Design a protein around this motif. Structure first.
Motif, mmCIF file in Angstrom:
data_model
loop_
_atom_site.group_PDB
_atom_site.id
_atom_site.type_symbol
_atom_site.label_atom_id
_atom_site.label_comp_id
_atom_site.label_asym_id
_atom_site.label_seq_id
_atom_site.Cartn_x
_atom_site.Cartn_y
_atom_site.Cartn_z
ATOM 1 N N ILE B 104 0.681 -0.844 0.068
ATOM 2 C CA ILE B 104 0.022 0.531 0.087
ATOM 3 C C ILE B 104 0.849 1.594 -0.015
ATOM 4 O O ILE B 104 1.560 1.911 0.842
ATOM 5 C CB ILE B 104 -0.797 -0.007 1.102
ATOM 6 C CG1 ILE B 104 -1.858 -1.071 1.169
ATOM 7 C CG2 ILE B 104 -2.091 1.008 1.034
ATOM 8 C CD1 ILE B 104 -2.764 -1.445 -0.059
ATOM 9 N N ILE B 107 -2.274 6.895 1.294
ATOM 10 C CA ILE B 107 -3.233 6.011 0.796
ATOM 11 C C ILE B 107 -4.409 7.804 1.000
ATOM 12 O O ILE B 107 -3.402 8.399 2.356
ATOM 13 C CB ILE B 107 -3.585 5.768 2.087
ATOM 14 C CG1 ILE B 107 -3.258 3.933 2.463
ATOM 15 C CG2 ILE B 107 -5.035 5.227 2.551
ATOM 16 C CD1 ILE B 107 -3.106 3.368 3.218
ATOM 17 N N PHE B 170 -6.447 4.283 -2.703
ATOM 18 C CA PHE B 170 -4.653 3.722 -2.302
ATOM 19 C C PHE B 170 -4.658 3.780 -3.747
ATOM 20 O O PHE B 170 -4.284 3.115 -4.899
ATOM 21 C CB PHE B 170 -5.062 1.869 -2.108
ATOM 22 C CG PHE B 170 -6.015 1.947 -0.907
ATOM 23 C CD1 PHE B 170 -5.261 2.082 0.757
ATOM 24 C CD2 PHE B 170 -7.678 2.081 -0.732
ATOM 25 C CE1 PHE B 170 -6.336 1.823 1.762
ATOM 26 C CE2 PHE B 170 -8.484 2.029 0.259
ATOM 27 C CZ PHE B 170 -7.905 2.287 1.256
ATOM 28 N N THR B 171 -3.211 4.062 -3.556
ATOM 29 C CA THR B 171 -2.031 3.993 -4.915
ATOM 30 C C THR B 171 -1.418 2.240 -4.493
ATOM 31 O O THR B 171 -0.474 2.603 -3.355
ATOM 32 C CB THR B 171 -0.914 4.777 -5.087
ATOM 33 O OG1 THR B 171 -2.085 5.965 -4.701
ATOM 34 C CG2 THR B 171 -0.047 4.621 -6.081
ATOM 35 N N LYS B 172 -1.586 1.183 -4.922
ATOM 36 C CA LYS B 172 -0.709 -0.028 -4.448
ATOM 37 C C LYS B 172 0.081 -0.744 -5.715
ATOM 38 O O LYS B 172 0.430 0.199 -6.969
ATOM 39 C CB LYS B 172 -2.019 -0.978 -4.823
ATOM 40 C CG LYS B 172 -3.275 -1.044 -3.517
ATOM 41 C CD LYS B 172 -4.098 -0.745 -5.068
ATOM 42 C CE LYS B 172 -5.053 -2.415 -5.191
ATOM 43 N NZ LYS B 172 -6.467 -2.646 -6.662
ATOM 44 N N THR B 553 -9.539 -3.999 3.762
ATOM 45 C CA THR B 553 -7.983 -2.806 3.016
ATOM 46 C C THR B 553 -7.354 -2.954 4.468
ATOM 47 O O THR B 553 -7.856 -3.518 5.237
ATOM 48 C CB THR B 553 -9.430 -1.271 2.745
ATOM 49 O OG1 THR B 553 -9.468 -1.107 4.121
ATOM 50 C CG2 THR B 553 -9.616 -1.408 2.170
#
Ligand SMILES: CNC(=O)c1cccc2cc[nH]c12
Ligand SMILES: CNC(=O)c1cccc2cc[nH]c12
Ligand SMILES: [Cl-]
Ligand SMILES: [Cl-]
Ligand SMILES: [Cl-]
Lengths: 695, 697
Positions: B104, B107, B170-172, B553
């Motif tokens: 993650i 966020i 969220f940047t995953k 999450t």
């Protein structure tokens, strides 16, 4: 750790005081005066009981007074499921074949017995352990017509420490003992068979009786003229309760222990007695369970039979757990190696010779003992048609006067008892097929009961066919088959009956094995006399108690819980909250009495609840108890009654061989819970009023 | 109640955590604008949680999380599942097909953005505010045109929280080259096996070791022999100081689902429909399976996994119903809604009472339908194996009605028939299960509500369920191999159209789909009313002691290492030891077999620096952290953020914790990190794994 003789109180007193005892030595046990000992009784030849009032009220377990509650129960007044509370002394129910035994005096008669024994001749005589011989010595010592000069009294001499110590007991027996009160079975047997040998426990295992006597307080059989006994001593009831680490003590009649077993005897107990019982009952119980679960009518008929088989099965599992995990074998080996080394040092080799004789006898009887337990567990108790009718010589010398009808009427009565309302021939065939398949795998052809040889010879090893043929052709295979026989009875039909031949054959082998094994007990017993004498001479009659033998003993310890396994702790006390947690209306074992459920909901605990408001039910203690201690009084440091012993946990059943400090506990019903049930469930205030309740 | 908190909520929870024992600085645990411990946490293979424990991308997770990968690399020659696997060099680490680890990276609260986009409403009853398609369209709009192409390895996702009252983007960063490094034998990794599932005390060494691989620059790359181990942003230090009773503990992970904002009517429905039906139906199924497995050792082999799989959710339902019955879950939800209704009345805003009423009304209206759905799903869809027997497709039926495509259809039907009647399928056992399950189903579901073919029980078979089931197998093309082969030799469309098993399977699936379709419209009024309900709860009592429901999450939870009393006079402590493994040893029971290397370690007391102060070897501990499914493999941290264990289970007494946290009963069951390091060292002998970790004294 011990079950001490009353004579040993003097030598144990100082340690008991260190552990918390506050009462004076002679107030507990006085050899020539009144003491608390005079308030303990042997209840109905097995249990222990205790006098709790100046009018002879006696408390004991519900499972101790169970037969008397059942005998007075009818479909109209079911005292077993509803409880019984006599609201007046005249309402108390008499009991036939009941007794209470008081231990009036106890004397050491060792020198007397040992001097009488010197007139032996035969050095291998077993008279030193013979009840007939010892009674002849007891009558000689007591006097010619002792019982006539001292009515209600009797004497008895018993051997202790394997024939190294002897005590003469003067007993006072009362046979008019009446039922006074009992909780319903839902309280008296709350755990029922699921919680047997289990701690935590929530069972209110108590029942109330009363000793009756003649006008002078002397023993008398049942008479409408009998008056309640005014005892010379009765227990005060404490309401102060128990706390963790409190001193506790018990007096009672423990039946048997095996504290002086050799390592070879522990191995034999494990690998023969326990392993065979475990394996054979597991097969029997497994088939019974399948059948009871599939047919609700089979469950009704076989519930008691299943429960009866599970009791000693559970004991054997518990005992084998101690042998496997607590080093029982090793500690017996260390005990005997230490005696052997001390005997070598003193130049006396008879102790090593004694341990060797025991080992050799154990090794020699191994195959015989294995064959005996295999037939006893596998067939005598495993298969119901093994106890089917066997015609006597009186009945055969009648079928071939015309009392042929009298012979058939006696056979019919026995057949009706075998094929009763709870007997299922289909369930029995299934149990027999599984039990005989195991028996035939373990016992070779040359060692089989004669009729079982037919499995290989006539049935090509088909056990199912052999069992099917026993019922298909036997006159005891069905009612119609018996009636066809009874109409045309011949001695030739009974002599060739497959069920009669099976039953006779297995009983013949069971008796032959018993008779062949009996001579092995004596060299062991004689060697144990030398073995225990050495142990006592070496380490003293101080921290080595004599084996239990149904005589009066005391034990002491503390109110303490224990850790049964990693990260799990069981405390010292259960509460009424635990009864409610276990409640299950659709399971007869865990049904909760509605009056008791209401008491709990309203918190109507009176003076019986603890300082925190929780109602106690039971507690456990580090006292050393065994079978025979059911109903034993549990005392405070002041000798006041705090509970009744009613069970012991399975983890401690190996305690009969080696006491387990970290696992073994006495399971006790709290006296406050007993009073709560008499008061709020029975509403029997008169019983509370006649007791001496101390604040 | 206790909480599965958003990372954003660390700031307002920090002071309480410090007062409960936390010593690390806030931004060392989580920093929105920098490296923190949050960067060492991964979503392992889309379900489990994992954690990076070295500067070379070593990852720890549960044994049951890496189980499929251990099984896929196992052969009769090298059985890694049974003996364990320990790669003695990085080059020996085994690649895995279809594996992933998700970091993650960032966020961000995007609530104002989403709520402004939602204002372009073309229907006030629109469900777009919860639509993954809609929210992805907003996520792509915000990230920019061709974000995935301009940032390889990264992806963006927006999720709704608090019933549509908060949104996070969220940047995953996803890595797909994740290799197997080490695993204990199954005797350690699944020591309790099914007997100890949901059980505390617990003695299972539930761990497995993997490694993230990446390209030369540490960027995500699919499996390639050129891939190099990842040098990560952050990794956990391993603590050897152990745990004591009352010690502060915390977890980060991906809890899947909770139902913290259920109304009292929803708790009653969960109990009286969902759980009671599942309990009753599985009890009948399991009872018949047990009798058959006990009577025939070959049936035990074939049905063990099927029996164990049915018992898992059965045990959960028993545990959940125990909490509803004894912990007052229904009453506490009723108190929660009555308090909001009273506050709304004072604010002169009746929409909250209207919202709770809409939920109650919807629950009451769908009751018979939901009862019929659970009854068919538990009773037949899951309960009876011949319900999943072959049903000829429209194209398969078309093929059987003048071409060579008839043999292609027969081959396809045969393949499905062999999967149904496989090596573990017993038609005799299935008939016995079906008779008991259908007898109960026919007692609960009236004739007018029955799947069409079940009406034949009363109409054609005079209510004899045994006769109906016997006739299905006697006349069906799928009743035996010989019956299928006779059909396959002379196949006709008419035979399949009148087949009793095909008709049964079709009928029960038709009713299962009709019920599902009729029940689906009831979810939306409840969801919309929950948005108003949760908004009220948050406006009234604040987004402080009311956590948003779990939704797969990243969350944190904190608590203490603490045992509990399960019943009167019984206490379970906070820690189990290696002695407890030895007490449970049973050589003639595959579940309780003890590894010989581990047994020898215990006998010699070869515990090194891993034993506790008393020389006892710790195995597992439990904590008052709030966890659920999705938290398997989660890192358990110290007051200093050091790894002290991995979460692997929760006790049955706490499964009701998904609705209401149970302080005195609910615990996370954790494998002690000292036991993990002991197994790698003394059982696996894999020193290189210990050396690459940063072990603190
Ligand atoms: C269900 N199991 C039991 O009830 C059991 C089994 C074996 C020994 C004991 C001792 C007490 N209970 C026992
Ligand atoms: C082997 N375990 C059981 O039989 C069982 C039965 C019901 C609930 C639970 C929770 C954990 N185990 C359970
Ligand atoms: Cl007296
Ligand atoms: Cl409003
Ligand atoms: Cl709680």
């Amino acid at each position: 750790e011990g079950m001490w003789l009353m004579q040993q109180l003097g030598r144990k007193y100082a340690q008991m005081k260190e552990r918390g005892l506050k009462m004076k030595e002679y107030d507990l046990y006085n050899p020539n005066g009144t003491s608390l000992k005079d308030a303990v009784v042997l209840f109905d030849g097995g249990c222990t009981g205790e006098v709790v009032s100046d009018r002879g009220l006696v408390l004991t377990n519900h499972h101790c007074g169970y037969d008397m509650i059942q005998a007075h129960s009818t479909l109209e007044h079911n005292y077993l499921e509803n409880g019984f509370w006599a609201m007046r002394e005249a309402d108390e129910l008499p009991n036939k074949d009941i007794s209470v035994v008081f231990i009036d005096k106890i004397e050491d008669v060792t020198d007397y017995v040992k001097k009488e024994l010197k007139a032996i001749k035969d050095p291998n005589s077993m008279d030193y352990l013979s009840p007939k011989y010892l009674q002849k010595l007891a009558d000689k010592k007591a006097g010619k017509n002792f019982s006539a000069k001292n009515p209600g009294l009797s004497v008895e001499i018993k051997a202790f420490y394997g024939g190294n110590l002897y005590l003469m007991f003067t007993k006072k027996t009362y046979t008019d003992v009446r039922l006074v009160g009992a909780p319903p079975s839902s309280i008296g047997k709350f755990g029922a068979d699921t919680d047997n040998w289990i701690w935590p426990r929530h069972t209110g295992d108590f029942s109330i009786f009363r000793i009756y006597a003649d006008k002078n307080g002397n023993p008398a059989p049942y008479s409408e003229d009998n008056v309640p006994l005014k005892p010379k001593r009765f227990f005060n009831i404490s309401l102060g309760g128990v706390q963790e680490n409190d001193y506790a003590m018990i007096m009672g009649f423990p039946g048997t222990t095996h504290r002086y077993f050799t390592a070879s005897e522990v191995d034999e107990w494990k690998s023969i007695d326990n392993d065979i019982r475990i394996r054979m009952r597991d097969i029997r119980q497994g088939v019974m369970l399948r059948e009871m679960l599939a047919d609700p009518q089979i469950k009704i008929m076989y519930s008691a039979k299943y429960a009866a088989s599970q009791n000693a099965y559970k004991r054997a599992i518990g005992a084998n757990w101690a042998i496997k995990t607590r080093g029982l074998r090793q500690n017996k080996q260390a005990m005997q190696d230490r005696l052997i080394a001390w005997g070598a040092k003193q130049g006396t080799p008879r102790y090593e010779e004694a341990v060797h004789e025991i080992d050799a006898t154990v090794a020699k009887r191994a195959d015989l003992r294995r064959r005996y337990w295999m037939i006893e567990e596998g067939i005598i108790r495993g298969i119901e048609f093994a106890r089917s009718p066997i015609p006597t010589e009186d009945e055969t010398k009648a079928l071939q006067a015309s009392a042929r009808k009298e012979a058939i009427d006696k056979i019919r009565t026995r057949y009706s008892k075998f094929a009763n309302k709870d007997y299922s021939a289909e369930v029995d065939k299934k149990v027999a097929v599984a039990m005989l398949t195991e028996y035939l795998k373990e016992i070779p052809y040359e060692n089989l009961p004669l009729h079982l040889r037919l499995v290989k010879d006539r049935f090509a090893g088909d056990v199912q066919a052999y069992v099917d043929d026993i019922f298909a052709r036997s006159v005891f295979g069905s009612e119609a088959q018996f009636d066809a026989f009874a109409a045309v009875p011949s001695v030739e039909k009974l002599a060739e009956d497959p069920m009669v031949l099976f039953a006779s054959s297995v009983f013949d082998e069971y008796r032959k094995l018993y008779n062949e094994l009996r001579p092995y007990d004596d060299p062991i017993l004689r060697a144990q006399r030398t073995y225990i004498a050495g142990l006592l001479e070496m380490d003293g009659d101080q921290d080595q108690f004599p084996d239990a033998n149904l005589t009066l003993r005391f034990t002491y310890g503390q109110v303490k819980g224990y850790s049964p396994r990693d990260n799990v702790y069981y405390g010292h006390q259960t509460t009424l909250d635990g009864v409610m947690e276990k409640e299950d209306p659709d399971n007869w074992e865990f049904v909760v009495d509605p009056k008791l459920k209401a008491v709990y909901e309203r918190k109507d605990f009176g003076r019986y609840a603890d300082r925190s408001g929780r109602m106690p039910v039971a507690f456990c203690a580090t006292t050393h108890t065994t079978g025979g201690n059911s109903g034993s009084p549990v005392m405070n440091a002041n000798g006041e009654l705090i509970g009744l012993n009613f069970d012991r946990n399975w983890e401690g059943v190996g305690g009969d061989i080696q006491y387990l400090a970290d696992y073994q506990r006495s399971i006790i019903v709290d006296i406050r819970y007993v009073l709560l049930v008499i008061d709020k469930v029975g509403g029997c205030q008169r019983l509370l009023d006649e007791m001496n309740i101390v604040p």
